[PDB]
Ligand binder design. Sequence first.
Ligand SMILES: CC(C)(COP(=O)(O)OP(=O)(O)OC[C@H]1O[C@@H](n2cnc3c(N)ncnc32)[C@H](O)[C@@H]1OP(=O)(O)O)[C@@H](O)C(=O)NCCC(=O)NCCS
Ligand SMILES: CC(C)(COP(=O)(O)OP(=O)(O)OC[C@H]1O[C@@H](n2cnc3c(N)ncnc32)[C@H](O)[C@@H]1OP(=O)(O)O)[C@@H](O)C(=O)NCCC(=O)NCCS
Ligand SMILES: CC(C)(COP(=O)(O)OP(=O)(O)OC[C@H]1O[C@@H](n2cnc3c(N)ncnc32)[C@H](O)[C@@H]1OP(=O)(O)O)[C@@H](O)C(=O)NCCC(=O)NCCS
Ligand SMILES: CC(C)(COP(=O)(O)OP(=O)(O)OC[C@H]1O[C@@H](n2cnc3c(N)ncnc32)[C@H](O)[C@@H]1OP(=O)(O)O)[C@@H](O)C(=O)NCCC(=O)NCCS
Ligand SMILES: [Cl-]
Ligand SMILES: [Cl-]
Lengths: 389, 389, 389, 389
Amino acid sequence: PSIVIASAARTAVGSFNGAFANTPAHELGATVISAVLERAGVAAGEVNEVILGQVLPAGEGQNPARQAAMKAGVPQEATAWGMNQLCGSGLRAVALGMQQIATGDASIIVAGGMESMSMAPHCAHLRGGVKMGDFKMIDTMIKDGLTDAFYGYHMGTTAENVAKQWQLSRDEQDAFAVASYNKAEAAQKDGRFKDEIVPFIVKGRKGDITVDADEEIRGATLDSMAKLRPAFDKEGTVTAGNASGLNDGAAAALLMSEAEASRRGIQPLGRIVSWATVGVDPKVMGTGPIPASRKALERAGWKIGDLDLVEANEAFAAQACAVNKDLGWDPSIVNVNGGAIAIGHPIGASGARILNTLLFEMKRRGARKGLATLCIGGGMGVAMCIESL
Amino acid sequence: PSIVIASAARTAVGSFNGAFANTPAHELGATVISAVLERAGVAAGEVNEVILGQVLPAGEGQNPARQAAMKAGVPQEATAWGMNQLCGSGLRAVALGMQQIATGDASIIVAGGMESMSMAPHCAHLRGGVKMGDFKMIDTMIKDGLTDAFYGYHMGTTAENVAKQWQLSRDEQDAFAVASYNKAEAAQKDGRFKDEIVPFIVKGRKGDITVDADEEIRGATLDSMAKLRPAFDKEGTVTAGNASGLNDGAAAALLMSEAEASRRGIQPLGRIVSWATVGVDPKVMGTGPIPASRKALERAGWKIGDLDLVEANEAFAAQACAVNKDLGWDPSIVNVNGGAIAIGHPIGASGARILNTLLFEMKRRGARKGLATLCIGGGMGVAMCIESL
Amino acid sequence: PSIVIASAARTAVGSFNGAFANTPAHELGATVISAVLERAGVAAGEVNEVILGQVLPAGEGQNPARQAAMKAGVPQEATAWGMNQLCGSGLRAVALGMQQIATGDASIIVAGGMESMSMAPHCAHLRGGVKMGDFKMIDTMIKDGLTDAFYGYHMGTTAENVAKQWQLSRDEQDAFAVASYNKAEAAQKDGRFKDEIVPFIVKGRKGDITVDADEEIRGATLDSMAKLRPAFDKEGTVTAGNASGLNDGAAAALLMSEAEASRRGIQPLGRIVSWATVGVDPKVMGTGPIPASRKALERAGWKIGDLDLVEANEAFAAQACAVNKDLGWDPSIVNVNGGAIAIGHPIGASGARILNTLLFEMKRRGARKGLATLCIGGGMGVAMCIESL
Amino acid sequence: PSIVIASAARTAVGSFNGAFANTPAHELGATVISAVLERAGVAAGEVNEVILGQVLPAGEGQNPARQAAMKAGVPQEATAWGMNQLCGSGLRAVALGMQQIATGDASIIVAGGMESMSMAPHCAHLRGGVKMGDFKMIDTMIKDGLTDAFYGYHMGTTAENVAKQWQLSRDEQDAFAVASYNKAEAAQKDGRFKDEIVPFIVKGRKGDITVDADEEIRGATLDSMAKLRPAFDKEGTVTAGNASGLNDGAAAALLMSEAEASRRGIQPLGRIVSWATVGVDPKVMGTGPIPASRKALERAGWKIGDLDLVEANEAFAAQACAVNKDLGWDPSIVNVNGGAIAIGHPIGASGARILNTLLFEMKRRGARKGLATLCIGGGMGVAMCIESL
Ligand SMILES: CC(C)(COP(=O)(O)OP(=O)(O)OC[C@H]1O[C@@H](n2cnc3c(N)ncnc32)[C@H](O)[C@@H]1OP(=O)(O)O)[C@@H](O)C(=O)NCCC(=O)NCCS
Ligand SMILES: CC(C)(COP(=O)(O)OP(=O)(O)OC[C@H]1O[C@@H](n2cnc3c(N)ncnc32)[C@H](O)[C@@H]1OP(=O)(O)O)[C@@H](O)C(=O)NCCC(=O)NCCS
Ligand SMILES: CC(C)(COP(=O)(O)OP(=O)(O)OC[C@H]1O[C@@H](n2cnc3c(N)ncnc32)[C@H](O)[C@@H]1OP(=O)(O)O)[C@@H](O)C(=O)NCCC(=O)NCCS
Ligand SMILES: CC(C)(COP(=O)(O)OP(=O)(O)OC[C@H]1O[C@@H](n2cnc3c(N)ncnc32)[C@H](O)[C@@H]1OP(=O)(O)O)[C@@H](O)C(=O)NCCC(=O)NCCS
Ligand SMILES: [Cl-]
Ligand SMILES: [Cl-]
């Protein structure tokens, strides 16, 4: 069978404790679900299932994916569930939703990801009681999202391991960072994000605020990156500038068979040709996209040179430089409008975020063969190949 | 294609703050993952992916499914992720794992569920700061697992609504409870749970303790159940006895193609013929399995009378009577060895728990056509049809 | 015997989460202790005991009064302790320190009060453990400082009771408020607070900041005060403007016998002639100063008309108007430089704050007979009479 | 003037999380206040002021001393306040109340101490917000009661400093421990605690329980105490047996002039002749009573040999041996009925607890000149001399 992406939308990537500081994840997910239905002309009463990836759902209630679907207008007859493959969750939900229609068990799937790292609460197991002494209040964002459970240190330390393993100097990593900021700043000015971004209405008590611009996009220079202190180790290279930040947002895509799009007169953004996921050593989780993209290309029967456009998520400057240096694809086609270093890294939603950036990127310049991939904590990677119709 | 279940295992369902009081979820998941590999003769280096459902992973670290696979012995080459469809998570992971091999994207899948409601922490959003006044510490088990996010009350209140519409007397619900305990009492005595249960070693500081028996099995009487006070409403019918409890445990199943099983000389427990999931009104979420089982049966080409054994999860006595009364299947084949009212309700693992109980019961008494289904909070249901080889 | 006040000092009253947001109470107290020693020519090695009132010391460590004395330079040979009579703590410590020298058990006492309501933590009894359900995180400032333990409502409700019992209109309370702001702002412009205020250096990571002005002194308007909604009752008269705020600060005074001051050539600010404390009904705790000041005046043998200057703490506009209406003293001599409505209300330190304001105003204009008094939560009041040497 | 102790009472010292696990301090204080009034024939409407020492009042509400007086029956006209000199609060409150009558400002004072270390909550300053990362939940009992704010370690470490500097072997410390337990067991068997102890009725949901016996009194052996591991240092000498525990309780005494007692026909337990408090190095806070008792004896004009009975609080076995070795008084008259090692150490109430034990023992065996003293955290000590009428 053939599965296409009829429409795709995403909210503007918000800053940590920024515009979406007090906005739950499912409310951001409800906006993109309603948006992909409007952009494709499909009614809510036709969605079979909603698949939204989310890593930090603590305190939001029973199944925020169902809450997002019901709030967006999807009726009670449909189903919904959340998945967690860390950073590659947003892209795997699209592949999982692709398999739902592939196995003949569904006809229309709204799949994507949503994440609100600002609303992540602090937790502590208190059922057994604390008879005496102090106890830690654990940050769910850091513990369940940003710390490798096998070695105990942050994901930035795994980037330091990649930097030591590939011999990536502080100047070479900062040079890759400023390139991402310069490509993202030009894209926001030229309006290359307006098609992907659906405006979100932050309902506040002191009036309403419309968010329709990635607020983590700033202007960095090569000298403003050499003054940043290392954020993870006292003798390291990864700083707050050459590393992706903590962000909120949501993204989704409307999936359907290739015959259904022709029946509805829908012109899909692209067709899902192949997907893949492979694991690596958690010490060097940043090398995840290397065998994942090659396995995706191997299943699609495509060479690396056949690709016309690449979206490789920039979790860190060290991991992004190695993947580009190793795969050897033309860096002029990788993250043409910037990357997660300049846009943001909403863990649950970043998988579908770079998919939105890629799908509209293939349409805007006439690219035919695209590829999106991300690195995953704990030593994993996911990749998907998209062809234009 | 054809997907079979080569092996299945489950831990004993532990009580709230009982044997697994201080045991993380992924440790229980590691035992079942390693068990299904031993019972089938498949090495750990052959698992492509691990799909484990889990509702309450707060404070356990990055992707507890990955931690369970690595601790069980699954190498770094494989991938892993967690899913959340509330109570139907344990069963949907099997269907999702079936689709991985169906689409030719995987060869060996270890799928199931794990949940540790005792290790569920209390949380509170504290990033924005508390300027003044008291703030609540939210229990993640109740909030993210046992409260409908659309009406705000407990799952027990939804059972009262099902009881009001289906005319289920106070005595008729207690009669279903004692029937579940008496069938569970006979199953534990006759040893019909020893094959499915894999022993877990609770390593404590005062020696080691082996857990290989469901510690929630007691002897209930009809008069000891009519004196229980309603635990959810001041004037109701749902009590602590006729409702599922808070429990810990894990369960899984090894998935593989039917040709691969014959090539390895494995005798599969059964073949996955059909699956389905549909949503219902959140007011009567206990009626989830009603439209789900018919959709699963219609895809398999089976009549309702064709089933030889049924495992319908007993979230509440009210919901179980309604699901049985509407489909009209012979009550002698539903939960022959007892149900969740007497065994326990590990949210993430209950979907695969009743699958293990069904698979080993179908094999020991020669049943050919089986069906497992559960109700899901928020108004959903999941069902799977299994045939024996 | 005769006990005089050789010197007195106070820190600038800081706003809630303002200049002293991250400054512990004992650090503010150490500055005032060092100040009263410099202004009197007495060394730190001569202080026999340090008595500092403090209402909210939770989480600050063992006996913050001892920490303030040690940090200020008082040697280990001396003693120190903290007391708690709520809002009258700052003034009762002076009377208690006066009794130390009166009974011949001490010769030089540094007495006063300190409070940091911004550093008040949230607490919860967790030793018995929370098996199930949510639990409240109790604000120590609200619970242990601003809530009557006999009727359960805020201290602002007791002001409403005083307003209802004394028939104090909303316009009369706001008129008293703007009068307090105008007297304090004009006093701050004319520099009538520089003598009392000792500058505090808030050592922050982004440089040092000197605080030498009560930062809650603002310009209020009658129309900007009549639009404020009542903060305690939905249909009431006490608002955030006509009520004292939550504030941080410290104040103290160096006590010594009248003969020792003449031996040291010190000109004391005043002599403590009489003191008194009496209790009232907790429903109308604002009437505390009424029988306390009358008992203090009778012990000194003074009539109400004999007073030349009065400092009656303005906890609320309702409580302050009632005290003036009952005692009947000339309002032109009460709070000449403003009150707690415009300066601030650090509960533990407010008792010594108005003492500093009274002592320095009596000295500059030649007043001989003064009286300071405050209302106390739970239905109490404290008052002290000061005569000039 | 002359101030006598007309009556005295105390609650049984409860164990940590024991009989008084859920009993607030002021409820224990209300029982002792009512008890000292009945034993002297004085009504509650005659008490001028209530002075209760308390170290851990976090979360109990506004001024727990006021709550204890009101619940015991003291009318609203009277006043009440709490003081905090750590371990010397219970005894210094008696001295402060003695000075109230000495300066002619009061006639009848109910003074003592109360402490409920089991009800001590965990706290954390959360107004400024936790931007990122984990934060500790501070135990108010450990932080504000048992940790030296100048060196950061527990009070047990100060005992280790005393033990190393005074040449006190670990076996000599354990030998002092069993002597305290054996003297307490014999005193409890012979009923020498019945006069001082007033029964407390713990009102629980499962019926009422009368507590009239110190539940921390057990039978210890020399070999069961020499096998205990040091609780403060990994290679130390202070164990859980030779150190005082965490306990709850309350104690008080009714103070009045010697002439007023004769007017009422009251036979006082003793007359307060002298009191004193002096500070020492916080490194060796256990040596507090050494210069404090010498100063108290010098104010009374008594030599050490003039004492007939001594109550020296046993905070630790190391500090108690050093105080006896330096002062050189006959150990046969010190703690005849046992000490805090076997009875308990309620911080706020220990000062008045050993006062009750001293007052009733001096009366029962005819002792004339007595002395009570305790060591105080942060490097202080307090002592009081009592003579018989
Ligand atoms: C690195 C990290 C800790 C930054 O945390 P942060 O401090 O709250 O973010 P900030 O923007 O405040 O960075 C701190 C400083 O750097 C500055 N800064 C950020 N980006 C900059 C840039 N491009 N140029 C210059 N300065 C920059 C900030 O303005 C700030 O200024 P300050 O010195 O006054 O504080 C966070 O982004 C991170 O850990 N990212 C990786 C997390 C993650 O998702 N890992 C998994 C990926 S798979
Ligand atoms: C978990 C649950 C049992 C809570 O009841 P509970 O009040 O917390 O149970 P308790 O903590 O009071 O302790 C268990 C009590 O039940 C009693 N009990 C348990 N099984 C019993 C039996 N078979 N016969 C008689 N009494 C029994 C115990 O003796 C105890 O009595 P007690 O209250 O006097 O001490 C249940 O009411 C519930 O809330 N389930 C929610 C989980 C859920 O939603 N499942 C469906 C998912 S859709
Ligand atoms: C009354 C109380 C709850 C105020 O709470 P608060 O909101 O945190 O204090 P605020 O100053 O921030 O009041 C908030 C609003 O009122 C405004 N406001 C405050 N004082 C004002 C004034 N004098 N004129 C005009 N506006 C004023 C603030 O600017 C703010 O407006 P905005 O936030 O809408 O822009 C608090 O001050 C209080 O409870 N005090 C009681 C003290 C007490 O009990 N003492 C012991 C009694 S013995
Ligand atoms: C010493 C201290 C750390 C121990 O706390 P604790 O361990 O909770 O006290 P416990 O009652 O639980 O004693 C626990 C252990 O010691 C043993 N123990 C206690 N008292 C004993 C005794 N009298 N004889 C023999 N063994 C004893 C217990 O049985 C247990 O050993 P176990 O593991 O074999 O069961 C704690 O009491 C403390 O900090 N005390 C200091 C109090 C203080 O500083 N007061 C102020 C003085 S200035
Ligand atoms: Cl002196
Ligand atoms: Cl009197």
